[PDB]
């Protein structure tokens, strides 16, 4: 399947690790040019990405400092000539529960998780409308299902769903598609490092994984990436406003399902 | 139908006008005790709520100053002895489009529209858990459907839908119900006045209303209030995590309906 | 709260037991007139309903014989002068799994569970349109979430959700509201008797109920009926096309939700 | 992007024309072997699929005669050695409105549109379980949003959404994925001929198409096929229970959206 993204430029926030890095590698393997906005870039990931795409660039930035975004996006546009797509992906489930988290710390969380989805989109939109491209927001099942001990993250992810539908409305006229991916549980090195923090790592993974209908296993990075990159590409050219769930049946299948 | 809310205390933010005021009246006429947090209270609304409920109170506050909330919720709880329910309703569709609104102005909208939903709920939760009460977030169609030129309002309303599900999860163990109402188009005095600014106020109303399948007309305040007050009451004792749409079919029915 | 349904006629299929009966009692208790279409009517239920409404009627019918519905609906209309509302409620989870149920037996399931939602609505529509009334479909969580061993019941319940949206579209211009209620687990006498057949009825109840976030307990019949009758009443006069879930958080809340 | 479907066998019902034929061509173009169950096969299509896959086969069947399905599916499994995927696609919007369609004609519509989704899945399941493959139901926007003059089609497509969730629950343990595609308006040669019968076919097209936010234009067959074949493929190996909308924003975007 020819995704027709060769030499198309995609900025991926938090594209240095985990899900965002999976999306970047697949974008690169398919001939697109990925540009990573993230706090740091592991040297080995930088090497793999350069090997995949000679035009790849890393821009070091903490996106809580959203005033830096206009200057950085402008550089990207000058260096490469335009921007086709944006993946808003940088975020952290910081498990801030309402009963013990101040409103001030909620706002701090929105700085780390939410505001730059707006700012990145705002500054990329001039260029993405030119190329009739794509915006993709990585949200989370928690914005839909809740979880119970993570008010700051749940509302930020739901807000990003609202942004998805709002921007799909705003730029349908422009042939710019806006979609979101809501993963449930995706195995990343950070996740594995968080499980290994447990007295019984296997038991703890099993507690989570047994609630996932398709295989009692976490979604892989590659599985999120495949759906993300397909959705970004011209091959999804009538898909917009979609909250997509490659999630093993987590959100939609009977909660009592077991085997 | 006996709603079983005689003397139950409900705080209603933005409850001085429009939708929230309709909820306060109904809450009161069914025997509940409404407590209004809002920027100001029209004299005539203050007189009407006092006739409906001798224990009703108005607390003047701009909820962008969310640090005032802890003190005010503690006062309510000391005066009446507790709090059964909270309606987070204060908000403004401020039509802030992403392409011409700064990120600083996005955050100012969230001060006006979003953060106090969290803070109000935070400070009421100890009392509402005590009474195994109800929290109701008034959200908006736009958080689900989008609109096109109101990025700050759509994300905030969608965020409030996430709060609704998150809190329903957090407090199911406590027998606290958390739901939302997503109105589409609701006729208020202030909506009527915005329409009246138009050279042709009727044409502008009809332009909007024709999109509404059930009757080509706006939802009334009473219609939002009936569903809100029923949903808050003990008669909806197994309803939680719901986003309710008393919206004339706006969100769900074929867009091409005519 | 005044629901404004005094002397309004509502036909409730399967109104003789379970959820439908709880809906019939509340309708009558709030001043409405319930008309029950069901296979049989327990004597003690006929007595309670008669005490709640002097004009309540029972019509004995098995709704797989959908050709009988036109004549039955016509007699109701002549007797009472009209019909304000219809509750399509009669149905059975027959646990017909695709891998060992024939297509023929799927169709028989639809005769029992599905076709009469259409025929009842068809024959009631002329009267409900005259009174700008209300149609309510009792569906199921399984139509949305699936279950795994009940193909016939899940597709029938999902079909009824499509009927709900389609008829809400069709009759919005007539000011006829059409909605649905999707219960999850509702404690009925038949549910309790089903549980009492297990080696350990309490432990089987708790196995099912543990998955219900709000109170680890079944929804009650009253809880369903309250949301039903409110939604039918003129007080929900801008509510249509809705699939309502008074279900304890079953459909929408995080599947991993866990509290002791 | 390597879909990893080389030599995988997919049966596509109604795959002779329109959406199903676009899915068949792309399946073959990506190395899969398509098998079409349909009423008839245009010569020009049989030639194009034969050119694309030397193992492609057509089986003439009117899927209302669902008893024929077992023998046909068994023939496919012997000939090709197995079946990896099934696309349930055959169907017709017959615009049967409740107020002038009998229950008997509703049931006839289900024979044309619904029952064979069940029978095809039932008979294909042993083979698809063996290959841990995929089932894809083509449904319709109308099963979600209603339309207003087509009760039989809206309920059938909603029932297929129920089947999608129910089968996804039933076979997750077997690593069998079950999803659905809900198109809104898709331009097919048959849709174009239908538009051409109008006094002003361009005006009628634009009346329908102006409600589609993304581009004021119908979805293409290619657009449906691409999402279909990706979702069927092993590259969507954690996607199940999904109702997917490649529909230009038809279902989810603000009904009042208006530009130019
Ligand atoms: N993994 C899951 O199970 C799961 C489930 C649902 C949703 N998600 C979503 O997936 C997205 C990516 O998460 P992940 O699981 O891939 O986590 P991850 O492995 O920690 O990767 C996140 C990346 O984003 C970067 N980042 C985060 N916040 C940033 C900020 N304010 N400025 C700059 N860089 C930032 C991180 O940088 P450093 O680590 O170097 O600071 C890291 O490179 C998130 O939006 C999350 O909501 C993940
Ligand atoms: N009306 C509709 O068609 C519609 C549609 C969808 C959603 N909604 C939702 O309904 C809710 C109420 O809207 P409405 O139409 O009833 O508006 P409204 O008639 O203008 O009333 C809003 C009330 O909230 C108050 N308020 C707003 N922000 C506040 C703040 N930061 N602090 C204190 N008070 C504040 C206003 O006070 P002042 O005016 O005195 O400042 C006013 O009393 C909103 O959350 C909105 O999202 C309404
Ligand atoms: N209870 C739950 O947990 C639950 C959960 C989700 C959805 N629901 C839905 O709620 C509705 C009512 O179920 P329920 O739990 O109240 O069941 P129930 O206690 O068995 O009551 C059903 C009533 O409907 C009657 N009935 C069923 N099929 C009929 C037919 N073809 N013709 C005439 N009468 C018929 C039954 O009569 P006989 O018993 O005399 O045959 C019985 O009186 C059903 O549509 C079901 O799908 C229930
Ligand atoms: N096109 C749209 O705008 C649209 C929108 C939403 C959903 N859909 C869905 O997409 C699917 C395909 O429709 P389409 O638009 O591609 O229609 P189409 O162009 O008419 O193609 C339908 C194909 O299926 C065949 N077929 C239908 N019923 C059959 C039966 N009982 N037995 C055997 N073959 C049968 C037809 O055969 P003959 O024509 O030779 O009889 C034809 O080859 C349908 O399930 C429909 O619900 C389409
Ligand atoms: Mg920085
Ligand atoms: Mg103040
Ligand atoms: Mg009979
Ligand atoms: Mg045949």
Numbering used by the authors:
A (entry chain D): 1 to 259
B (entry chain A): 1 to 258
C (entry chain B), D (entry chain C): 1 to 260
Verbatim from the authors:
We also characterize the putative dehydrogenase Cj0485 through crystallography, enzymology, and multiple biological assays to confirm its function as a fucose dehydrogenase, which we have named FucX. Several aldose sugars in both d- and l-configurations were screened as substrates and Cj0485 displayed substantial activity on l-fucose and d-arabinose and with low levels of activity on l-galactose. The Cj0485 monomer adopts a Rossmann-like fold comprising a central seven-stranded twisted β-sheet sandwiched between two trios of parallel α-helices. The holo-enzyme’s asymmetric unit contained four monomers that were arranged as tetramers with identical D2 symmetry to the crystallographic tetramer observed in the apo-complex. PISA31 analysis predicts this recurring tetramer to be a stable conformation, supporting the likelihood that the tetramer is the biologically relevant assembly of the enzyme.
To provide insight into the substrate specificity of Cj0485, we solved X-ray crystal structures of this enzyme alone and in complex with NADP+. The holo-enzyme in complex with NADP+ also crystallized in the space group P1. Kinetic analysis of Cj0485 activity using an excess of l-fucose as a substrate revealed a preference for NADP+ as a cofactor with KM, kcat, and kcat/KM values of 9.9 ± 1.9 μM, 16.5 ± 0.7 s−1 and 1.7 ± 0.3 μM−1 s−1, respectively compared with KM, kcat, and kcat/KM values of 6050 ± 1080 μM, 20.5 ± 2.1 s−1 and 0.0034 ± 0.0008 μM−1 s−1, respectively, for NAD+. Though we attempted extensive co-crystallization and soaking experiments, we were unable to obtain a ternary complex of Cj0485, NADP+ and l-fucose. However, comparison of our NADP+ complex to the ternary complex of FabG revealed insight into substrate specificity. Despite only 45% amino acid sequence identity, the NADP+ and l-fucose binding sites are comprised of identical amino acid side chains, pointing to indistinguishable modes of substrate accommodation and consistent with the matching specificities of the two enzymes. The only notable difference, likely owing to the lack of bound fucose in Cj0485, was the more open conformation of the catalytic site in Cj0485 whereby an α-helical “lid” enclosing the l-fucose binding site was retracted by ~5.8 Å relative to its conformation in FabG. The apparent selectivity of these enzymes for β-l-fucose may result from van der Waals interactions between the enzyme active site and the C6 methyl group of this sugar, leading to a higher binding affinity compared with d-arabinose, which lacks the C6 methyl group.
